Amino acid sequence: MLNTTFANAKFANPFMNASGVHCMTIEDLEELKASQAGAYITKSSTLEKREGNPLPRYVDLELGSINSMGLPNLGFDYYLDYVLKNQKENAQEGPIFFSIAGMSAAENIAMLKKIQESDFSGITELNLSCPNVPGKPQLAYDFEATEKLLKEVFTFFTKPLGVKLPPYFDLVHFDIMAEILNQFPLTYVNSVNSIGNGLFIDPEAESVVIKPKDGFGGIGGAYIKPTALANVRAFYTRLKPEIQIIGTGGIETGQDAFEHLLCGATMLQIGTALHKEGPAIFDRIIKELEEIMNQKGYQSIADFHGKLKSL
Amino acid sequence: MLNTTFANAKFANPFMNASGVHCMTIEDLEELKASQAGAYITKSSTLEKREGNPLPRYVDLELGSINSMGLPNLGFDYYLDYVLKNQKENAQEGPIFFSIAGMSAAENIAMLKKIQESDFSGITELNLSCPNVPGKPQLAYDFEATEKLLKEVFTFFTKPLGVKLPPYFDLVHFDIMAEILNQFPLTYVNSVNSIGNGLFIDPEAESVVIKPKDGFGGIGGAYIKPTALANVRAFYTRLKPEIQIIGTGGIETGQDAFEHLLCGATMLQIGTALHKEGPAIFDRIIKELEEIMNQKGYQSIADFHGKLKSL
Numbered sequence: 001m002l003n004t005t006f007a008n009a010k011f012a013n014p015f016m017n018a019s020g021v022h023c024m025t026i027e028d029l030e031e032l033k034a035s036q037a038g039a040y041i042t043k044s045s046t047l048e049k050r051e052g053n054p055l056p057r058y059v060d061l062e063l064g065s066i067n068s069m070g071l072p073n074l075g076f077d078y079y080l081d082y083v084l085k086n087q088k089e090n091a092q093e094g095p096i097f098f099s100i101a102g103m104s105a106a107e108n109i110a111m112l113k114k115i116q117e118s119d120f121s122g123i124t125e126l127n128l129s130c131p132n133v134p135g136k137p138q139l140a141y142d143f144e145a146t147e148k149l150l151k152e153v154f155t156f157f158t159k160p161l162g163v164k165l166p167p168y169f170d171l172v173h174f175d176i177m178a179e180i181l182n183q184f185p186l187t188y189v190n191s192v193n194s195i196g197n198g199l200f201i202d203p204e205a206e207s208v209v210i211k212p213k214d215g216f217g218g219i220g221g222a223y224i225k226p227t228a229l230a231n232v233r234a235f236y237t238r239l240k241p242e243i244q245i246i247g248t249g250g251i252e253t254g255q256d257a258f259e260h261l262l263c264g265a266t267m268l269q270i271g272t273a274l275h276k277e278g279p280a281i282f283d284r285i286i287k288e289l290e291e292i293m294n295q296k297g298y299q300s301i302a303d304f305h306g307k308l309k310s311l
Numbered sequence: 312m313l314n315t316t317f318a319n320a321k322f323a324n325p326f327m328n329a330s331g332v333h334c335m336t337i338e339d340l341e342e343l344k345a346s347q348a349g350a351y352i353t354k355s356s357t358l359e360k361r362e363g364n365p366l367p368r369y370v371d372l373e374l375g376s377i378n379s380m381g382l383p384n385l386g387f388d389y390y391l392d393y394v395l396k397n398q399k400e401n402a403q404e405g406p407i408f409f410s411i412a413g414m415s416a417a418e419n420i421a422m423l424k425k426i427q428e429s430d431f432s433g434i435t436e437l438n439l440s441c442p443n444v445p446g447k448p449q450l451a452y453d454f455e456a457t458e459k460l461l462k463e464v465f466t467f468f469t470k471p472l473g474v475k476l477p478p479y480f481d482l483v484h485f486d487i488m489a490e491i492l493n494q495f496p497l498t499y500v501n502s503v504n505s506i507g508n509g510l511f512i513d514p515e516a517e518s519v520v521i522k523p524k525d526g527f528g529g530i531g532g533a534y535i536k537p538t539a540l541a542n543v544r545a546f547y548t549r550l551k552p553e554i555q556i557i558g559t560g561g562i563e564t565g566q567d568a569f570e571h572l573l574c575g576a577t578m579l580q581i582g583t584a585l586h587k588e589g590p591a592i593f594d595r596i597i598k599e600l601e602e603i604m605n606q607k608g609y610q611s612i613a614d615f616h617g618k619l620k621s622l
């Protein structure tokens with residue numbers, strides 16, 4: 001009963017992995033294809049293969065996780081060849097999502113041109129918010145640079161495109177972003193990427209727990225649900241209906257999923273919890289969401305989607 | 312063993328209430344004076360009395376709190392007369408802190424002029440980040456507006472002044488702010504105010520939990536510690552040594568306090584936990600911190616202050 005329509009495609013359920021979790025190699029991707037995830041997305045890629053930051057760069061926290069991966073990925077070509085080959089063996093219902101995170105505007109345009117010129121018929125996600133790349137600030141916090149990039153992208157990109165955004169914390173920022181985004185034929189916006197540059201400390205050792213950037217890393221998990229929900233909701237009420245929303249952040253139980261959908265998310269991505277549990281999480285959370293719906297007498301997501309009530 | 316020197320004043324310990332919690336009326340303040348807090352601060356005031364937002368506007372959460380108080384306060388004159396009367400009857404070792412949060416630059420300058428002209432010899436905290444006032448974006452997220460205001464304030468304000476800042480999530484933002492602040496004879500910066508505009512949902516009722524701003528409110532408590540610690544540490548390494556730091560955010564145990572001190576905070580403010588526990592919290596947390604220090608063989612905060620180790 002979780003059938004979903006997103007970007008003109010039908011998915012068995014709205015669950016996907018969040019980019020960067022369990023999607024580094026073809027082996028990881030095949031495991032997601034074999035799981036009950038309704039769809040899956042590749043690790044954000046760059047033109048050149050990258051090793052990422054020094055270890056340790058990821059730590060499981062009681063309330064979530066902190067990481068500073070530094071974009072380790074097997075390179076743009078590796079992922080493109082994989083998706084193109086999978087396009088031929090139609091053994092999946094729905095398109096695959098392809099994430100790109102170029103280190104500069106030039107690199108993102110180059111990758112998008114290649115995607116546009118290829119036979120790829122899936123969905124592309126432009127990551128404008130990686131908080132863990134030393135020397136590179138989050139492009140999506142610079143409204144002007146963001147508007148400039150999107151203008152150049154839409155002069156040639158005609159395929160489905162969505163943007164992964166960092167969290168915003170001021171209503172006026174939502175107004176400004178929504179206005180910039182509403183002018184483009186975007187397929188979706190995905191909120192949110194990690195809460196950037198947080199710090200976790202081991203009081204006994206009196207030190208940080210991750211090696212890169214003096215311990216500052218992206219925060220995810222339970223810590224960020226309040227912000228994730230707010231971002232999904234704030235955008236749901238300001239974006240033109242043509243642009244759908246993928247909600248990412250703090251999803252660990254069917255209840256968390258239910259809350260994102262109530263705010264207005266259509267697809268849902270699980271990061272930290274999937275990293276901790278493995279692909280079996282999809283089976284568990286699908287069962288949990290269905291139980292919630294059963295108890296409430298709901299037979300489809302359309303019964304409550306975007307219907308969060310004010311007081 | 313928690314003796315502290317801050318703004319050239321000596322305090323029995325570094326603990327104080329965070330502005331807005333247990334400090335609305337003279338009765339609240341007197342209870343703080345009678346508790347074991349090393350110092351205390353008043354509720355942010357405006358020139359005129361304010362009722363604040365409709366109820367419910369504050370909700371305790373398992374991992375913190377969410378609120379949209381709307382600056383309810385008894386007015387600038389009420390707090391000033393109270394602090395002035397207290398100065399006469401010298402029954403306190405250490406100045407009292409006075410928070411102001413005018414709805415416009417003009418209102419802030421007017422209150423500051425009044426403080427400058429009065430006999431007030433305590434410390435003033437200028438709130439540049441109230442995220443719960445409908446229609447007003449956080450001034451501190453506007454670097455240019457913030458620089459202008461401080462430029463004007465320092466052309467006449469000669470008494471001790473500190474600034475309460477909203478959390479920042481991009482290292483470049485820390486660089487820009489540190490450069491703006493370093494040019495002024497500021498006494499301190501207080502990081503951080505609530506994580507702005509989060510959302511909490513009651514899944515059973517399928518609605519938000521607070522009435523104002525459609526349920527969007529400031530987040531505090533365990534949810535924000537990683538961000539709080541990061542802000543304190545990021546500023547500690549960029550600000551000129553003359554500007555000290557007050558760390559606020561997610562403090563509820565001695566260990567949380569220890570982590571803030573390890574990052575570089577000198578004074579510590581407790582918000583959410585004090586709202587939940589009452590002034591008796593000071594007695595508990597002081598014992599917990601001393602217990603940690605005893606186990607490690609530390610006899611004063613100077614032994615580990617700002618000594619967080621990188622990997």
Ligand SMILES: Cc1cc2nc3c(=O)[nH]c(=O)nc-3n(C[C@H](O)[C@H](O)[C@H](O)COP(=O)(O)O)c2cc1C
Nearest residue numbers: 018019020044192193194220221249250270271272
């Ligand atoms: C180990 C790790 C790596 C990540 N890598 C990326 C990445 O390559 N691309 C991206 O857009 N987001 C990345 N994310 C961030 C997320 O996709 C997601 O937005 C985030 O973790 C918030 O969700 P969560 O609370 O479920 O973790 C990563 C998160 C983690 C935990």
Ligand SMILES: Cc1cc2nc3c(=O)[nH]c(=O)nc-3n(C[C@H](O)[C@H](O)[C@H](O)COP(=O)(O)O)c2cc1C
Nearest residue numbers: 329330331355503504505531532560561581582583
């Ligand atoms: C009920 C409430 C009212 C608040 N009022 C103010 C206020 O008037 N001025 C201010 O600077 N901060 C205000 N804050 C924010 C805090 O002083 C503090 O920055 C925040 O709660 C983060 O700390 P915590 O994690 O200990 O709550 C308020 C917080 C709460 C819980």
